[model samples]
Target chain A: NIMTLPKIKQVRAWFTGGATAHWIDDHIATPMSKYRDYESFGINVLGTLVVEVEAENGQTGFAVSTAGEMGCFIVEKHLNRFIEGKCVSDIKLIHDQMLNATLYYSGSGGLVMNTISCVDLALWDLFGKVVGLPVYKLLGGAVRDEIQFYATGARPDLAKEMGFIGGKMPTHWGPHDGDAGIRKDAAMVADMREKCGEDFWLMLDCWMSQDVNYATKLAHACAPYNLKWIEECLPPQQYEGYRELKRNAPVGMMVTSGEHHGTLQSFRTLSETGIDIMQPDVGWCGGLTTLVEIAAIAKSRGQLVVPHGSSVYSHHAVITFTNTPFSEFLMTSPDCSTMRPQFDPILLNEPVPVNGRIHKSVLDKPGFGVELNRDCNLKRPYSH
Target chain B: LENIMTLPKIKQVRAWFTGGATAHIATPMSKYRDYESFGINVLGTLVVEVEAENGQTGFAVSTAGEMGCFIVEKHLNRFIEGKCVSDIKLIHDQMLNATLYYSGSGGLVMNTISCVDLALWDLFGKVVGLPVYKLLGGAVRDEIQFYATGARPDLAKEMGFIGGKMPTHWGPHDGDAGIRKDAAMVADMREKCGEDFWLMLDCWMSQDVNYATKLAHACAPYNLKWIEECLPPQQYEGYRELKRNAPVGMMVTSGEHHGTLQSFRTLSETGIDIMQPDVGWCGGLTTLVEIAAIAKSRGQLVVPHGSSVYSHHAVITFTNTPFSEFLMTSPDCSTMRPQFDPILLNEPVPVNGRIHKSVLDKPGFGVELNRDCNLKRPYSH
Candidate 1:
């Protein structure tokens, strides 16, 4: 028989140092990269916000995102009220209330969303802990025995040798580089294709720095290299551009985007663009609550939902989503030379792929099955 | 500081949490009345105060409770502080963008945002030595007539209110028996208040289309003025259908639960006769003014939901907002009382159904946070 779990007794927030390296600001093509000194942009200035929700029964669960101090403020001040007195099973109500409460400021995606996602994951973790189950088990159990991975970083040749099924490299030059941009990116893909051979999957991560024409040209240029898919060539809101780019792409080529989209409606619209894959960052796109909905939207359309790298947070949700066949393992190590936990040092026992695969048993521990590394330079900026 | 240029910057924001009455108020949970209290009443009240550099302060209340305080102390404090007192729009925009992810259409977060916005307006009014109505182009009318929302309309009529709005005790679950029971109450109130007093039913988002439409016809003989919020706030099509199916003479109205300006616009398109937004719950006076404009564009009345002085300032200035609601907070509903009760020291209620512009001539919203009220200020930046 089932028993009621303890109500959430406290909700706390902390943030790691801004110097933590994960969100690369250098050399990566971004929407703002067209401007001078693109690397100077403060994309990584906030570091990461860590949320810990403690239930009344002494079970504690935690999660992390790039929302930083402002995220800490929101979690401690506003979002906690919805969490503190509710049963651990009341995750949906808390999720809905938090989303409804912050509509004025969330704007789909930003620091606010990152915070909401962090809190949402924490609640899921807390709920799982109270029930003595893994977060994946709480989400209707896993459909597959294990998860396969494709590496996203600067090295496809290195990723292939390390047993990753595929390698996704970010385009260094965008539309600003004109034909030369296509030439350079295509050359990188060509070099990887030569090194990894015909069967290995290779893809381009445009990082939202191209228009329809440029993306189409780049897609066609890289098609000879057997690029498995072209990812996020246009911004999150570019529905028409995505459709047009998809229409103009070479036959059998897949179009993908949506890591920056924060709402369920955005994913629905992105899905309508004929993109083959929907890549929502679990921490950026309204958390696992909205992630399940985005997956259903894709599954109904026969599209795949491969969440952008969020380690275990993505693992638990993707393992339950039948539409999600495989997942992405973001290479967070500085040189992309070895596998480092995506949110490295911040989360303890943060699982990474072993030979491009993660067995379901590795995620069988209670909750999200990872602990917050208290040894990390965590700062609690405010308290309620 | 006599003008915008010389006004003091907002120095800080403080939020206090206090519980509210969890009495019988019909809601979406009215069907489950046998098991628990009304759902809407479970939310506590949040009182937000803003202090200016000049040491003058202004405070207002909304329904976000402790959740709201967190938003104010942690997320919204930066937006409120260090800005010129008159920069309400910029602050409003910042706060809205800051909490959009979780604020959805409207909920606890919008309530907090509204409270802060009202406090800013109040602080600005005090700085400039003017009332909020004066800041928003002054009142067009000398007095504001109000309808009383409570259990006893007969007693309300004796108190000199323009009309009476009562909560329907039974919802769709009780079937036609529920309709007949409520209709009898309408008939009883009609006889007590007499023929001329305007009577309406506030369903509080508890009934479905068929039940509400049937209830409308049943109460039509008593000449009910309108049927309000018969369905959830998001039921735009239901509202449209209710407006179409309702007894021709009876009016359809809603919007008390609607949050953003866009939501009101969508609600307005559903053809509800009146738009009743709570000034403290719908993004503050700034968004309320915009909601009123949206109503005015369609030639509809914008009788804001009961919020005492917070509604009084903006509604008095709006040409479309002819009358406002004054919810009876007293348990028995036998006499007039302050809407926010113990929390606000100077909250005004209509005497003999009307409040003249002179009644609201005080510096800000003309209300002060009562120090005697039990409130806990949980966090501050």
Candidate 2:
């Protein structure tokens, strides 16, 4: 018998990490540190939303929503009022209610959306667990067998490893520019391209540096190396500048954006302007429902779809999209290790490509097909 | 004059955030999406008054809300304590430069500066018995051209405005379907309004490079003013490519997203045919003035986006800026309608549906807050 999950039982928020620390000491663990050295910046702000659902079997399912790491406090304060005691089985209805309730106060983007996204995903997990079916089955079944993914990691030791075909690296050295800056950017791209070789793909992230003219010059400079696409060459809002670059630059050279854009409207505007590839972060772009809408928009335009930020949930979303060209893997950054370990061990042992590309498949396990790491629960005094 | 003066001393400072639907709506809605993140819980209003001799008082109304309040109380209040109001610009600069540690850019700092600058202007206007626009450089044009924006065709058909621009789709799909949707919308507008009226379309950046070109080709017959945000603004090269391929005589206008004068300088250098600056968001009147000057120098047109009264004053001030965008999304969004004082009713609203009269005669950009629309609150640190 189908039964609606009752209102949430409780919600909690916590914070960790000191306000200030150096790259080596804080991010990377020293010999004195007890926690496993994640190798990347371990310091993070963690936010989790736990929704208690009353199921028909007289069991309470706890749906846990986790954001990058430090925003749980906001979820604890804002989301509790909407989900406590509400029927959770109506996933769509509940999602709409939570979004609509926050629309006037908070909608589309920012910390609020990230907070709500985890809660929404948690609810779906609870619902799927109760129904004895995977989350994809609830959404009209999977369209693909296995999800494809791109390997995003630092290959500083490239020749030592093999089998990966493509990868992505940051576009700029730092905020300022000099000969050193130019050399840093050029060398990073050249190294990746050389390491990966011909037919191996490489994408560079500019992280919103450079104006149109600078981007054009850079695009030309990097063309000989054969880059797949330049991600976020300019700031998000400079559409005309980007359009000018597109007009003057090579056609095959692709540009991907929309990670900072908040809604379908913004993405729609971006898509209308023509990007080689439209990359939307599932976690940032209002979760799977909005991502699907954005993907459909991209597919309709004959553009490729690549979701930024690799997570198990995003993998599910990418698999669902018939036209998704690639899934990003974070080779660097603290979140990468924190989230990757949660994936099913069976999937990780396979030959994962080093270049950022992946195959699509539906997960046999329920919901995101992963669990939060127990170590993520460690609490420390708040610094910032 | 000096000996007989009697006055009460200035005492406390206060601030408050008020929620009111814009003229057409019951609650004030955010014009931009990202503003909600800045703790703009409501439309913020700040009022500061000096207790002077014999109750001969001076007061200033500030649109800058929470962040502005912080600046005023923490920094500006001490500097302006006993300073004479006659030295408005001097005080303005002092308040602006008080904290060199934080160079004032566009966001909270500028918003705060704008509120203080506006209040000082209000004080100046009252002192001189002239309006704010006259105090600047006097009006260049008698009226400003107003473009009726925010008109959702789907919603407009239900209301009365038959000729309107409809939203277009983007992303990967059959180019023909998107074009067909645009054409259908234009045709529907023409059907509702007779053939004599004008109609336009907004692609809203929902297309890829190829599809944007196709949609522009499809939109040529409708005689659009310009396809707004046809593609993402960052893709300058793509835009230049599209501009080359766009239908003849259909000008491509953007740059509303460009943040500062430096940004506009780069955009103008790039081949975008039109420039739209949002006065409020792009650093209020001061930065926008610089943007207008830069646009004029480049021989490009400046159509200030979402300016309403603010843009009208700007358009009237500058000869190069000819049109102002007016979104007719919700009745509440339109401040030019009957219920409100038509930010520029004295100026021509325009007829060919493209150009309107610029508001030139008014002083200090001819804008004064309607206190009733604003809520009053005490300043908090």
Candidate 3:
């Protein structure tokens, strides 16, 4: 006879600004940048939502995401019904129902997926802790001994010194700035290459700010410096644009995207664009359940899936993924000089890369191997 | 230069919920036939009122309940207050993306969003001294015809309605016996309402593709005008199959539960004949107009799910919208009633199954929010 796991007794959510970082406000190029003050309209305007799913046994599992107070409302009023009273191992069923329930308004992706992703991750974390194993082990165990890292921020040159295998710098200007914008970015790439050396991986994160022509021109402009990749060059739905950009891009330069894209279908459609890498954010791309499917989409196409930096969440899955090869470490520090945990001040015992890599042993603890920092200002706006 | 100082900015937002008979209606949850109260009214009905700095107020209603109040006051208020009244599109985009983490296509969050949008449009029209229809590119037709949606098509036929759409009493859970019962009802209604009268079955998203196809063919002899909302809103592939398998002359219609323009576009690509978006629930009039355009581009009709004047103003302006639905909100569906009863004063209804454009020439949505209703404002900002 099979023993059943503890049922989820309660689902609680909190809204907070504790995880808000300065890097998001660092004039990151965006679709709205052409109107001036792009950061004012970007994703950072809302605070983070932390969701906790507690089993009847009193053990709790929690994960953080975007959507702020609205996400709290969804969890408290709507989504909690699908989570609470269900067995901890009912993650897939819960995910399917939540996805279907939110289909009317979520319309592919955005804040709704963020809230769903949080609940899904919390479910996985709860399941792992209940089973007395790490999330990676629950995900069929790690295929490798460790995961290599690439830092994403302003100073990729500093990241190279910090022992990261690669550095993904955010582009400063976009199509609105015309040819001068490409030159400015190319100069920065050339300077970073000169400092970090030829063997180091250097990529540019466009942050969905450029068009096909602008992205193509920038790709060629930075080709001499061996710019390893051009990331998220167009909006999430621009499959034609991505395909054209990929075709027009210089040979050997990788095209990567999917940080803002949600749903398995979005990735499947994006895969057809011929991008060299599929960079889904584990927190934003339907959590670990959808991430595994997205990984298979990449593996079948011989494409690499280096998830956008989501700290421990990305570390656990990428460690088990055979085709992942390496992972991203988003520098949240103000000047990008130090290695801060991506979701700092909120997650306790959150691991960071040591000498450009993190071993599977560091991720061996139960659940996500981290605890929620109670000291952080968490607000439960509503209750079931 | 534009005079920015003279523009009226939104001063505050207030949201509330009210109990209604909609709680007893059939819906996607209708398969549990004995569960008398499984409709959207479980959240009750929501009213969102937006007031501008110039002392003018506009309000709209839908089904979002107390949960909607929380979203409006706590989260969506920031995007509304201090914004210009003419910034309806901007506010709509903000509210949609802001709630996208929760509003999957259409539901309570979108219901609240749609309510806010309708309120904003109402306020904007009042400020400009123009009726809502005129603001939406003027009217394309002189009057809009109507089809009554209620339990009594016989009574609706006596009232001059062009057609009668009755909710199917049995669904997939009842099996072949269910099909026989529903078909018998359709045949009975056809006999009572006369052979020339258009008859339809509103399945309310309670059937699968095979069950719907079988039901469609079963009702073919009865001259069923269309099979409405036969499957869940997201089952586009199933809708295509149903459209393909339905009796040749019978129409396959849906979209009342569809919440966004994109969803309507996807549904349109399924080759369905009509798109019946409830203007108040599908992102308000703003999204409804776009949905109509999507239908127009494909030579399909857009009969908005009845929401009184909210549907009237937009439908009159749409060339593709030949006729609109008049939902009988009366308790027993015997008498004529306003779709969103008592909450709206001066609400228009089809007389002899027809309403003239002259009836909707008032500013904003041309009707005033009834202050006498038992409105409970749970949140204020």
Candidate 4:
């Protein structure tokens, strides 16, 4: 077994779903929220895809990301060429090879990066097993013993009741709704302030559906509520809009974006445009490997790097860096409640926060410390 | 067979594993032909194949050579295998995205995407049972006009081409002798082709801003077409100055090397009169469409670099693009043919100097592999 170095025997990816699992409010969810627009968004099925990479030495690891089913083809096909044979320690080289190999197509986004994220997740998990240490330790030990969380959902009262550092509420209406819609949005923030008290943090997640005029007016309207930040108000590609929004926003109000931004090149634009906060999704933003470079660049510019919600992956990232103020917990439930795990039917042993905060110990387990639920139906539509 | 197939789905994708193709040109083609200098004698054809579920197939050929070919073949299986042939845009996006980080836009990466994209269009055309040009809003005109790129200007004029663009024989490095030689060459071509026939010069980005200005001034008497790639591509500022300083009506053209629609958006501000985007090296047809739209909005012209059947379909679709390029790359530099190993059915070569409108009748870019070419995959052989 120890003749030389351990190589991955094979990697498999497939879709998994549960019985009670129901589709939720995707960008294009039906019946549409009375508060915001959903025309540009697409339907979101509840369950996503899962990937498992087994090392030759009898150790196996599983990883999941926002890549969902699209990432599966990459993992089973192109990614397999990069993986399937190599020591787990060579994760860095393996990453560069796969990314470089696919640079003609998925070098930065789509299925390529999505698949890379999954491979990184499993590789970290496998490495964590091989070394008997968690991903945080592999990523230069935890800076904070306990990780704090800021709930992202529709409820601020529930967030404070759960002891989160802050609550970022999804903005229901934009300028598209007219004066009445703007007022309704302000009223929602006001209601959240009244329910959770002014001291509690409340922010807006416009989901990139709002334009500059709409966002500016909404930003002005919500000023009375004293919002913590307005995120993704304009699409990520609109750098001028981001810079303008950041400059136009009310004093003490921060502008947060980059959740949908793909690479370090994108982060350079965000950094230059001067957004108050840089939020990168660990899965989509080049995995843990690329995220470190992003964090360093953010650090150089004195910008705060708070990764978007892929808690399973970002959990380790948040724990390893002092530059990251705290982590975000996206309450993906239909009502955005923390009760009943967000990805319950999919992940086993998913770390749950006690009173709006998860312990560092939860993330101390090797890799992401989550596994695919065997009870779910898994479908492998691709293979080598 | 190059005959259109009925609703074919993509079943397999591959890279032909031939060692390489020989030099079909008289002089060695530089790796960086658009700008700077490099030594590359023979240019191999980079080909990509999209096999249908029914066992029929279509392929795209690129001037990107063996390295470009290998890059596409190695990464071919994942982006396209099992995809429906109709999803051209989706597959193009996937291919473009896959290499964004490493290749960014131009050169080998965009060329690789271009090959896959053309093949997908070909596969799609066969599946739908229609000519590729018909799919692109049909033809804008009866036949595409042409400008020849070769060593023999007199030969091109004899062929009845609208214009003939000869490679510039001298640069700033040659000083007054080179300057005088360049002006004399332009004068000779103008004298040979006559005033009505268009005469242009391809400096290959060898001249500086000052030399280009002087050369433009000297050639003004000849009423030459735009000077091509006088400065390196990244020197957009240099181009803007050259355009500002050039003789009236001497349009500045560039960006045969620029990849991605974003790059073209930036290149537009350089004030070049024409934009030469190769469908092969500029992220395929999906990307070229975006580039074309940008150029049209900006009042710029798009005459794609390197004449391939790949760019021919795109050239016919848009109003801003009136004609296409034809290279005279024969060993003796006389005829207008850059040889290829793959046997395409039509492979649309310009007739005399103008291509007949009917050459685009067959589905796709109208090229079929010559079975005797002995193409094989890595392991199968």
| lDDT, residue B330, model 3 | 79
Q: Candidate 3's error at B174, in angstroms?
A: 7.2
TM-score of candidate 4 versus the correct structure, residues matched by position = 0.63
Query: Which prediction has more favorable DockQ, 3 or 4?
Result: 3
Model 1 iRMS (Å) reads 8.6
Native interface contact recovery, all models: 0.00, 0.00, 0.12, 0.00
Q: Candidate 1 vs candidate 3: which has greater DockQ?
A: 3
- Please write out the lDDT profile of model 1 over residues A238-260, one tens digit for every residue: 56678888999899999998887
Residues A1-384, candidate 3, lDDT per residue (tens digit)? Answer: 776689999999998862221665766677656655233443444588899999999998999887676677667877877788899999998897777555544545656687889999999999999989999998899999999998888888889889999899889899989999999999999999999998899999897778899999999999999999999897665666788889999999899888877788778767877888888887778898999999998999887888888888888899999989989998888888887788898899999888889999999999898999988788877776
Model 4 DockQ (Cα-based): 0.06
> How would you order the candidates by TM-score, starting with the best?
3, 1, 4, 2
Predicted model with the maximum TM-score: 3
Top of the candidates by DockQ: 3
The worst-scoring run of ten residues by lDDT in candidate 4 chain B lies at B23-32
Question: What's the true lDDT of residue A146 in model 2?
Answer: 59
Q: B162-184, model 2: which lDDT tens digit per residue? A: 24554553323534764677666
Error of model 3, residue A308, in angstroms: 3.2
* Stretches of model 4 off by over 4 angstroms after superposition: A1-5, A17-41, A45-47, A68-70, A174-178, B1-290, B296-347, B352-381
Model 2 DockQ reads: 0.04
* B-chain TM-scores per prediction: 0.95, 0.66, 0.94, 0.89
